[PDB]
Nucleic acid binder design. Structure first.
Lengths: 114, 114
DNA sequence: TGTACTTTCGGTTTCAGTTA
DNA sequence: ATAACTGAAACCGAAAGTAC
């Protein structure tokens, strides 16, 4: 019904517009989400916050030129959404937050099971 | 007929028993309703939830000593009631949630207009 | 059956407390 | 010596649910 996160995230991954946001199997049931710490020198605000920024735009919580950009908050929102969502589940021991290009790994729950 | 919220809240404001629950003009068409986030250290359940608790008793949705106290649910109920009420309108740009003693500002709609 | 709320849904925001 | 991060929980609006 009123759920937007499930299809939207799937769409972003399927789009391939976000390097590192990729499927891990061909069943398209496990996927990889870039998760770089915004304090690292490796961080580029445009690319590394692009997914969080997309979600903030899509949900109407940010408008270009009008609201001050705030990547940390964009990040917190999507993290917290993924945490509460019944549609997604982190495979915490497959996440690689400790590498040069870090990422969390998520499973997509079949529609019914809850 | 069976609408209870309008008179009840007006009565609460007139009662003066809820510090911060006050009229903003002498026509008694605009009022201030305290709206503190319960996560603050400044939060005291007895005083800051007293109105939300009162609405829960009046509507029979809580009994002291029997049901576990639950101010968040108390708050949600009154908020969702005000959201749907045709008797009240938040003056969202005069509400002050960003101050040490936060409050929302409400307008009372004249009885007829809808 | 329509009204006036209430509860639930699907995320959002804030907190105290970590971690980079 | 501080920005960013975090899970937990309070919070939110929309809208489905429901007691008259």
């Amino acid at each position: 019904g009123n759920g937007k996160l499930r299809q939207w995230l799937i769409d972003q991954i399927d789009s391939g517009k976000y390097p590192g946001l990729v499927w891990e199997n061909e069943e398209k049931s496990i996927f990889r989400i870039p998760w770089k710490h915004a304090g690292k020198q490796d961080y580029n605000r445009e690319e590394d916050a692009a997914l969080f920024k997309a979600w903030a735009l899509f949900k109407g919580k940010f408008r270009e030129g009008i609201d001050k950009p705030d990547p940390p908050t964009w990040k917190t929102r999507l993290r917290c959404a993924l945490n509460k969502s019944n549609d997604f589940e982190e495979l915490v021991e497959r996440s690689q937050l400790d590498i040069s290009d870090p990422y969390k790994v998520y499973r997509i729950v079949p529609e019914g099971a809850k």
